Amino acid sequence: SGAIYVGNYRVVNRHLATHNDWANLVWEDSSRDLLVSSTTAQGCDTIARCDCQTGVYYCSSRRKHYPVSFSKPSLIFVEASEYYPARYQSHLMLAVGHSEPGDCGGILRCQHGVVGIVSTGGNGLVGFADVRDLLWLDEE
Ligand SMILES: Nc1ccc(-c2ncno2)cc1
Numbered sequence: 001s002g003a004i005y006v007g008n009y010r011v012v013n014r015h016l017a018t019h020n021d022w023a024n025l026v027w028e029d030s031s032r033d034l035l036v037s038s039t040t041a042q043g044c045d046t047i048a049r050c051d052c053q054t055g056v057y058y059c060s061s062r063r064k065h066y067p068v069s070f071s072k073p074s075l076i077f078v079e080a081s082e083y084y085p086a087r088y089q090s091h092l093m094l095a096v097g098h099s100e101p102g103d104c105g106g107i108l109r110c111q112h113g114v115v116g117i118v119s120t121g122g123n124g125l126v127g128f129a130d131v132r133d134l135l136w137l138d139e140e
């Protein structure tokens with residue numbers, strides 16, 4: 001699990017979204033495994049606006065932060081999960097690293113802020129759903 005809190009937005013894995021996330025839906029993209037819901041409390045997270053390909057992600061299954069190199073956001077084929085069928089995911093970044101289902105929502109960050117959240121795992125790769133292109137997260 002895990003979320004990004006920026007302004008009056010909550011960003012979560014679409015597959016881990018709650019009924020309150022869906023009842024307060026702002027935006028969702030099944031292709032990206034992202035959902036944004038509205039919050040009453042102001043979020044203090046900063047979204048990275050950059051093209052960094054290095055950063056640090058939290059891995060709950062190891063209670064550790066790992067530094068990783070990651071690919072630029074791409075359309076990647078992702079195998080079947082306990083949450084999705086084997087399909088293409090857009091705006092996905094891969095790194096060599098440890099990712100289990102419960103690691104989803106772990107934040108990836110660079111010097112500029114939040115880059116994305118863990119979304120995919122397996123074959124010794126971790127996929128992160130990019131958020132840096134969602135410029136609208138940083139106003140009203
Ligand atoms: N009034 C509502 C609110 C949420 C949901 C829902 N969330 C996830 N799946 O269904 C359904 C009805």
Ligand SMILES: [Zn+2]
Nearest residue numbers: 050052110112
């Ligand atoms: Zn950056």
